Design a protein around this ligand. Sequence first.
Ligand code: AZM
Ligand code: ZN
Length: 260
Amino acid sequence: MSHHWGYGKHNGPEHWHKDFPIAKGERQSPVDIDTHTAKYDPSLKPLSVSYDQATSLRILNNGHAFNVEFDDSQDKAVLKGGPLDGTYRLIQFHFHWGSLDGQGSEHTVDKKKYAAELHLVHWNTKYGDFGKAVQQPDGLAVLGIFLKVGSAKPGLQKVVDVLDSIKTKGKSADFTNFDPRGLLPESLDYWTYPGSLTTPPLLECVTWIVLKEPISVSSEQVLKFRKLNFNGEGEPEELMVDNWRPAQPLKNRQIKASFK
Ligand SMILES: CC(=O)Nc1nnc(S(N)(=O)=O)s1
Ligand SMILES: [Zn+2]
């Protein structure tokens, strides 16, 4: 049992994978999030998030997929809470689509699947930029937002009118004075699921968070995109969906979460 000191055969060879805890901690395993098995963990530090200045300026398309831009020139919204060593700022996000006329999201929570979901990427500003954050595992994290269908337009009539302007991909339209808070609650507690990507052991500087209060969206909002092209006009009528991800459950004993 006693480990004789003075040697170090294992302390000799050193590689890229052997350097970072990427290979030493392989958690690459896609699985559906379960709320029933989730457990409340009040270990995190309760904090208050901001989002009063949060506002958009315009929306640019990439000829297929577009993301919403925000004015980082001010203190829009910031996230904080837990053993984190720095606050997380948000810059932009996008939404995925589905192949079915009822559902088709990336991950599935509470053994349930949604039609679409928002993808808000954030980077710890404490480390300066994502470039310095990627240098460590707990550097930069990713927030995963989900969207549920309610068929009840929360007063987005105008949002549908401006949409007729971006019928084809590759164009843009200036749109400021957005109200993303009108649908986003304070959100105190929320489940979590840290780990790495579903790709070979390379990087683990990505965390997967999930809020217990997903942003609600009407089926009428996506009913307009259904008629839109998947990449500019002139192409065969096909769905713009292209964000499918597997997650077969092996067993799932207990999942970490800040909320019960
Ligand atoms: C390098 C990289 O970011 N790749 C992906 N981007 N996000 C993707 S998604 N949300 O469409 O799955 S492809
Ligand atoms: Zn995405």
